[PDB]
Enzyme design. Structure first.
Site, mmCIF file in Angstrom:
data_model
loop_
_atom_site.group_PDB
_atom_site.id
_atom_site.type_symbol
_atom_site.label_atom_id
_atom_site.label_comp_id
_atom_site.label_asym_id
_atom_site.label_seq_id
_atom_site.Cartn_x
_atom_site.Cartn_y
_atom_site.Cartn_z
ATOM 1 N N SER A 108 0.690 -1.424 -0.296
ATOM 2 C CA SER A 108 0.084 -0.122 0.054
ATOM 3 C C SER A 108 0.709 1.189 0.017
ATOM 4 O O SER A 108 1.759 1.343 -0.973
ATOM 5 C CB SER A 108 -0.834 -0.073 1.226
ATOM 6 O OG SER A 108 -1.736 0.874 1.509
ATOM 7 N N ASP A 181 -10.490 -5.442 -2.343
ATOM 8 C CA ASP A 181 -9.880 -4.455 -1.539
ATOM 9 C C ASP A 181 -10.528 -3.155 -1.669
ATOM 10 O O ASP A 181 -10.635 -2.595 -2.921
ATOM 11 C CB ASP A 181 -8.376 -4.140 -1.964
ATOM 12 C CG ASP A 181 -7.622 -3.346 -1.014
ATOM 13 O OD1 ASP A 181 -8.171 -2.519 -0.400
ATOM 14 O OD2 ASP A 181 -6.378 -3.563 -1.115
ATOM 15 N N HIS A 216 -7.759 -6.116 1.435
ATOM 16 C CA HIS A 216 -6.517 -5.223 1.632
ATOM 17 C C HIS A 216 -5.438 -5.778 2.574
ATOM 18 O O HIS A 216 -5.243 -5.913 3.748
ATOM 19 C CB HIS A 216 -6.596 -3.843 2.282
ATOM 20 C CG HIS A 216 -5.452 -2.954 2.286
ATOM 21 N ND1 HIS A 216 -5.009 -2.419 0.854
ATOM 22 C CD2 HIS A 216 -4.595 -2.315 3.139
ATOM 23 C CE1 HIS A 216 -3.951 -1.565 1.289
ATOM 24 N NE2 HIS A 216 -3.798 -1.788 2.560
HETATM 25 P P1 LI5 Z 1 -1.741 1.571 2.931
HETATM 26 O O1 LI5 Z 1 -2.523 0.323 3.850
HETATM 27 O O2 LI5 Z 1 -0.455 1.974 3.340
HETATM 28 O O3 LI5 Z 1 -2.675 3.028 2.491
HETATM 29 C C1 LI5 Z 1 -4.039 2.740 2.817
HETATM 30 C C2 LI5 Z 1 -4.403 3.520 4.053
HETATM 31 O O4 LI5 Z 1 -4.255 4.863 4.205
HETATM 32 C C3 LI5 Z 1 -4.420 2.572 5.207
HETATM 33 C C4 LI5 Z 1 -5.388 1.720 5.867
HETATM 34 O O5 LI5 Z 1 -6.684 1.860 5.025
HETATM 35 C C5 LI5 Z 1 -5.264 0.908 7.008
HETATM 36 O O6 LI5 Z 1 -3.959 1.302 7.471
HETATM 37 C C6 LI5 Z 1 -6.280 0.277 7.311
HETATM 38 C C7 LI5 Z 1 -6.123 -0.446 8.652
#
Ligand code: LI5
Length: 237
Positions: A108, A181, A216
């Site tokens: 992510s 996701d 995710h």
């Molecule tokens: P990534 O997960 O680094 O970026 C996506 C969101 O900003 C983060 C996120 O939805 C979470 O950390 C969910 C637990």
């Protein structure tokens, strides 16, 4: 020996330890294939107000106690506001001190950052060659609405150079995304995938995409992670 080495960059609200736990399946396969997987912690320490989603005080304390109030950069929905300087320097310093790395793996925010680093590694770390492989898990680029193309997105000007991919890259790109996701909808990962595919003139042997049915998360199912690891190990040979 020294065996090939991959650097792993975690996602928002994780740390190296948690990312290692979440990627245990892929790591098991890589270690069996005599590949070293290094995990590091993102430098930006978050306060509760820095979360873009709801969380209660108890769960926030739990986050603190687990040392997972971490990001590669502060979150923003407005891409031009993003600042990756500290996170980028942290990774660059690590590579300077502990490299060279044969490849990189990001989740992510870590995948947005690892993609940028993949593009720029030989400039960021003088004497460091291109990565052999770059694994982009639930990644995305720093897009915004394209004023002249309603409904379409463009990369924000600040990060145009960052996400520019040179033709004929040696690096094999491996994109992974989850069909379920909602945190990072797969349209965003495909948008980033397309940049690499185009730079490689549509060569799907050099730019690969794997979709899993989950959300995710780092995938762990045998039928997905086995071919992925095969592609990694073949690039390292
Ligand atoms: P990534 O997960 O680094 O970026 C996506 C969101 O900003 C983060 C996120 O939805 C979470 O950390 C969910 C637990």
């Amino acid at each position: 020996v020294q065996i090939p080495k991959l650097l792993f960059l975690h996602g928002f609200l994780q740390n190296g330890k948690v990312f290692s736990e979440k990627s245990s399946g892929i790591r098991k396969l890589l270690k069996k294939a005599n590949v070293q997987c290094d995990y590091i912690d993102a430098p930006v320490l978050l306060e509760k107000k820095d979360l873009p989603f709801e969380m209660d005080d108890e769960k926030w304390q739990a986050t603190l106690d687990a040392d997972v109030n971490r990001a590669w950069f502060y979150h923003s929905e407005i891409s031009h506001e993003l600042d990756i300087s500290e996170g980028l320097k942290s990774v660059v310093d690590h590579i300077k001190a502990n490299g060279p790395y044969d490849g990189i793996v990001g989740l992510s925010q870590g995948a947005a950052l690892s993609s940028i680093i993949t593009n720029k590694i030989s400039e960021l770390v003088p004497d460091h060659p291109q990565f052999k492989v770059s694994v982009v898990i639930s990644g995305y680029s720093f897009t915004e609405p394209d004023p002249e193309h309603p409904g379409e997105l463009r990369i924000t000007e600040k990060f145009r150079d960052s996400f520019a991919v040179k033709p004929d890259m040696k690096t094999k790109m491996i994109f992974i995304y989850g069909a379920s996701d909602q945190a990072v909808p797969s349209v965003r990962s495909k948008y980033l995938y397309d940049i690499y595919l185009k730079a490689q003139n549509g060569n799907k042997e050099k730019v690969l995409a794997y979709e899993h049915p989950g959300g995710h998360m780092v995938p762990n199912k045998k039928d997905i992670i086995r071919p992925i690891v095969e592609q990694i190990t073949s690039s390292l040979q």
